[PDB]
Design a protein around this ligand. Sequence first.
Ligand SMILES: *[C@@H]1O[C@H](CO)[C@@H](O[C@@H]2O[C@H](CO)[C@@H](O[C@@H]3O[C@H](CO)[C@@H](O)[C@H](O)[C@@H]3O)[C@H](O)[C@H]2NC(C)=O)[C@H](O)[C@H]1NC(C)=O
Ligand SMILES: *[C@@H]1O[C@H](CO)[C@@H](O[C@@H]2O[C@H](CO)[C@@H](O)[C@H](O)[C@H]2NC(C)=O)[C@H](O)[C@H]1NC(C)=O
Ligand SMILES: *[C@@H]1O[C@H](CO)[C@@H](O)[C@H](O)[C@H]1NC(C)=O
Ligand SMILES: *[C@@H]1O[C@H](CO)[C@@H](O)[C@H](O)[C@H]1NC(C)=O
Ligand SMILES: *[C@@H]1O[C@H](CO)[C@@H](O)[C@H](O)[C@H]1NC(C)=O
Ligand SMILES: *[C@@H]1O[C@H](CO)[C@@H](O)[C@H](O)[C@H]1NC(C)=O
Ligand SMILES: *[C@@H]1O[C@H](CO)[C@@H](O)[C@H](O)[C@H]1NC(C)=O
Ligand SMILES: *[C@@H]1O[C@H](CO)[C@@H](O)[C@H](O)[C@H]1NC(C)=O
Ligand SMILES: *[C@@H]1O[C@H](CO)[C@@H](O)[C@H](O)[C@H]1NC(C)=O
Ligand SMILES: *[C@@H]1O[C@H](CO)[C@@H](O)[C@H](O)[C@H]1NC(C)=O
Lengths: 309, 176, 600
Amino acid sequence: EILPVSMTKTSVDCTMYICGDSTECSNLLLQYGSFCTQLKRALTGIAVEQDKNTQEVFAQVKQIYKTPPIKYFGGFNFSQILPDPSKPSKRSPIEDLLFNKVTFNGLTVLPPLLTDEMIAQYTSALLAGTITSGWTFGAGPALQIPFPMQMAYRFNGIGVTQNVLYENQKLIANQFNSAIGKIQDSLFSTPSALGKLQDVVNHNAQALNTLVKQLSSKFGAISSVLNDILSRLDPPEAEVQIDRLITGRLQSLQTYVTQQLIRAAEIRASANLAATKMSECVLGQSKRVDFCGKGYHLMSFPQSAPHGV
Amino acid sequence: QLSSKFGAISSVLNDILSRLDPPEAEVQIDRLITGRLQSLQTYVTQQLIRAAEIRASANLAATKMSECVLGQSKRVDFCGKGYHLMSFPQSAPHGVVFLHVTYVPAQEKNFTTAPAICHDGKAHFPREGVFVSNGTHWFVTQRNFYEPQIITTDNTFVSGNCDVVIGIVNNTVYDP
Amino acid sequence: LHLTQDLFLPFFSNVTWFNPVLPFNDGVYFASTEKSNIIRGWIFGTTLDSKTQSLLIVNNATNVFIKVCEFQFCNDPMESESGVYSSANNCTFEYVSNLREFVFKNIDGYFKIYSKHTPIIGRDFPQGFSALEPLVDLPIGINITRFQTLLADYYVGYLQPRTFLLKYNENGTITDAVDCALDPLSETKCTLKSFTVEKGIYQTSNFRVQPTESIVRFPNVTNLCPFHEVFNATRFASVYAWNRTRISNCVADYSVLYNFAPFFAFKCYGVSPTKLNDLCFTNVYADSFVIKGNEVSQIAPGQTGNIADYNYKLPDDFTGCVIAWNSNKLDSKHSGNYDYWYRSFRKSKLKPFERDISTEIYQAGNKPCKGKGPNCYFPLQSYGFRPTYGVGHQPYRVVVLSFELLHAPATVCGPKKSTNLVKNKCVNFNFNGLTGTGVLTKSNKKFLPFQQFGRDIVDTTDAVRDPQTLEILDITPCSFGGVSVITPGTNTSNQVAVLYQGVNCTEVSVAIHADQLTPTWRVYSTGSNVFQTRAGCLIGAEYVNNSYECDIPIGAGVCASYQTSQSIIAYTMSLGAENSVAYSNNSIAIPTNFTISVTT
Ligand SMILES: *[C@@H]1O[C@H](CO)[C@@H](O[C@@H]2O[C@H](CO)[C@@H](O[C@@H]3O[C@H](CO)[C@@H](O)[C@H](O)[C@@H]3O)[C@H](O)[C@H]2NC(C)=O)[C@H](O)[C@H]1NC(C)=O
Ligand SMILES: *[C@@H]1O[C@H](CO)[C@@H](O[C@@H]2O[C@H](CO)[C@@H](O)[C@H](O)[C@H]2NC(C)=O)[C@H](O)[C@H]1NC(C)=O
Ligand SMILES: *[C@@H]1O[C@H](CO)[C@@H](O)[C@H](O)[C@H]1NC(C)=O
Ligand SMILES: *[C@@H]1O[C@H](CO)[C@@H](O)[C@H](O)[C@H]1NC(C)=O
Ligand SMILES: *[C@@H]1O[C@H](CO)[C@@H](O)[C@H](O)[C@H]1NC(C)=O
Ligand SMILES: *[C@@H]1O[C@H](CO)[C@@H](O)[C@H](O)[C@H]1NC(C)=O
Ligand SMILES: *[C@@H]1O[C@H](CO)[C@@H](O)[C@H](O)[C@H]1NC(C)=O
Ligand SMILES: *[C@@H]1O[C@H](CO)[C@@H](O)[C@H](O)[C@H]1NC(C)=O
Ligand SMILES: *[C@@H]1O[C@H](CO)[C@@H](O)[C@H](O)[C@H]1NC(C)=O
Ligand SMILES: *[C@@H]1O[C@H](CO)[C@@H](O)[C@H](O)[C@H]1NC(C)=O
């Protein structure tokens, strides 16, 4: 199950975009009220909202948990999800597939506060806590317990007596191993598994492309370039052209900002949903139907992805 | 923003009216009207977006009150950090404050555990407890609070013989 | 707290402490500290040589006598008697009535004087604050550029347009004004409209490296254009037989033509600079006209009439200049110049840039027309150009210049000296009329031998080659970006750190060195305090290898905080403590006690 969590943080300089470093244009823009201040405030709010979204989704763990060196868990494999030290950035093979599968004029893209390595470290800590201490570490101090006993408790959690697990442990371990193996092939052969994240990226790219392209529209003026108009007429005549260009570009900026605000609200809702899923599906067993999978839920494992989980 | 000229002669309608001819005055008034109307539209759109956000927050608060206050919730980290016990609402200006009461364990203790017990050549599993040992004697206790009890037939149930369970351990189950 | 932009004295500026003629740079600041009453007044004006109206100011004992007169000299070129002065002639305006501070401002013909006489205790320079109240506003309305002190221990400063934040007291008295371009902290203070700032990151204005030089590169072709010969042609053809004359491959220095003939009808419709010499345009298409007096009005875009419908039509989207002058003594005949003809009848309407050549008789009747007789009129009338006609009927000579300004992949530029090309430098460029700013480098583009410019996916000029060198080069723009300020709060301290987002540290250091950054304020930039990170260049603090919890988020896992030897430190964020659970085949931890915790 894939869920977007974040969005690219963008900051736009109102003055440079509207006026191409022209003092005459700046003087005229100065009489249009505090529009640029409002745009800057909205963009900063969006950026801090994105940072808070990722912080809330991935930082639900108190202490970084480390898995023991020996990784025997009663036949369970747990290799494609645990980090592999024999590579940079310490990412799991599935995380490697996820990252390898995905992929000017006053516009700046601010980098996220938490680097991808930190997100991977949070994911590893959560997964290690889940597989070592069970679900107890989410409700207080971590309590060690052998994995087959945790699985027996989880079977008791869905109305199945625990003797079933101790009777068919080998079969269940083999089934889980095969199921976890098939996921790699499912995400490898199928190229459109991560459709939503790419859709978010494409939407942001389209918005930026439209914003930069609309700088070349005349809006019923002599030309789309300020400097040529400035060195073409006396200021009193050129003022009308400057005003028309200013109005057009300001409308473009306002439209872009409103669209970005709506998209940010949608991604905020998605991030809240993802945080709820991590709190309930991962840090414990949920009895809600069709919430943590399709069937009787047992457990879940998170994996980091670009702008998502 | 009412004091912004918006590229006009002035920001007061009276001076514009009693300073120029009707056509130029009409043009200036049109520019001022366009600017002020755009300001109103921007304000209304911002208010709508904030209203949607607060609507989502209010829905969340209503759900929390319906599930954390009017009953005990089993959802993890929904009604507080830890196992939920109860909650109390408190009215606040333009909001609500929840006092979540949670149960948090402490004072860990280490023990040796076994999946089953093989007394009469038959496997035994705890009914709802966990088989723990303090080195010498074996006991069954709750999985959330240390309370050892003597292992007995009324405390366990038997399922199969002693060759399937991997970690099965010899012991004695005293029948009452 | 009012934020206003006006002419002010910049804080901590150089002040000359002292009779030279100090220039009046649109506002001066005068502060004299004496008890001998040597200072008595001032003189203002442009030349001050008894030609313009010089402003005279004198303060004898209590009141300032203000006069606007025309004088060669005043009393000023053992102080026992002096009332004679030198001259007070031609007075066109009259007015009467420690640490003497004065601000003199002139704007829109209004002379504003701000005074403040605070008898400070002692004679040391006061390290304090005191506002200046408006004394008088005189609307004399004269030009002033120079001024001199009048005599019978003072400071002079010049005002610059700045932005200031002023704090008004409950009784509306200005106390403790703060500048907005002095210090990074006193820019965030202006941004937040408060005198106290809190600990955290704060966005502020944007930085941009300014251009260093300006290079103009035009292709050499120094032939002057044959504009004068066209203008000084002996005889022009008929208005319907207008001579098209294409001009190309020469220098469009027609500014000299402004003086050869006394133009009276000089209107430019699409482009009207007085200094039309920097314009490079492709086609000019000079035209020659001979019209009457009350006909020049018909030569205009969107104009209709007999000429527009039968003789000559101008397009609505016309970009050019229309020039006309009198031709009484060179385009008239005593008996009537019966040689200039014009079309009068046509069974159709003209279109822009079209000429009529057919001379067949017009058909003005329903029956087919064959010769004269019935209602058939020849569509040609000879002008009776007589010297006795009035201004509205006197013949005029008109020339129409139709420009086509769309970049410049062609010839015909005005007179402008070329300049050497500069590579690898943020320099203004004017390649053949294509104007912009950027850094020019060697380009490996395979331009076919007809392409001049080059665009990108966004349709911005990304490459150009000048004909004088025929060498292809790209137009990568100069560096820019946003800057942010790190502060630990006003209460804690005043040290700040700046972060130039999305720029290399070497580039920003080079720009700082050769005084090229727009935010003229400079952090001290000591050694081992310039840190490079993916967020940008952070010249405000040193980097420490220790790990702490994040306090002031910067980005890319780097956070800043104020520690104590108090200074700001930048460190990599730590994700809490580490704890490895001792997992085992048979080992379980069971709690033996609990805690009832309550959270809000
Ligand atoms: C009307 O427009 C035509 C086309 O532009 C003009 O054409 C030619 O213009 C030149 C210069 O005025 C005339 O002089 C000749 O120039 C050549 C240049 O190499 C020179 O070698 C000759 O000795 C001579 O000076 C040329 O006669 C003329 N050709 C024609 C067919 O007219 C024309 O001058 C314009 N005349 C007007 C304003 O009525
Ligand atoms: C857990 O799963 C991994 C992944 O398949 C197993 O690693 C494979 O081991 C076999 C036996 O040597 C190799 O032929 C494969 O090439 C390995 N796969 C990969 C992707 O390297 C591993 O054996 C399983 N069991 C344990 C205990 O790790
Ligand atoms: C396990 O028990 C031993 C002694 O019984 C103790 O020393 C050790 O700390 C325990 N492991 C824990 C508490 O993780
Ligand atoms: C373990 O529990 C038994 C219960 O009776 C007690 O007698 C004994 O002292 C405890 N400790 C050890 C080491 O057996
Ligand atoms: C448990 O008891 C059975 C039956 O006596 C015996 O075969 C087995 O070895 C015992 N296991 C242990 C660990 O003592
Ligand atoms: C302001 O005016 C009041 C009333 O005259 C006076 O008491 C007070 O001292 C004045 N100044 C300040 C700084 O409050
Ligand atoms: C004139 O231009 C040509 C071609 O660009 C060039 O080769 C020549 O050196 C130039 N001459 C002068 C004097 O600039
Ligand atoms: C800054 O420039 C230097 C040399 O010009 C280069 O080595 C370094 O990689 C640049 N910085 C970044 C972040 O690329
Ligand atoms: C748990 O049992 C396995 C059986 O294969 C063994 O390899 C491993 O060492 C054991 N773990 C211990 C003794 O800590
Ligand atoms: C549990 O901890 C509390 C401290 O909060 C202590 O007062 C109490 O005695 C402990 N319980 C036992 C059985 O020691």
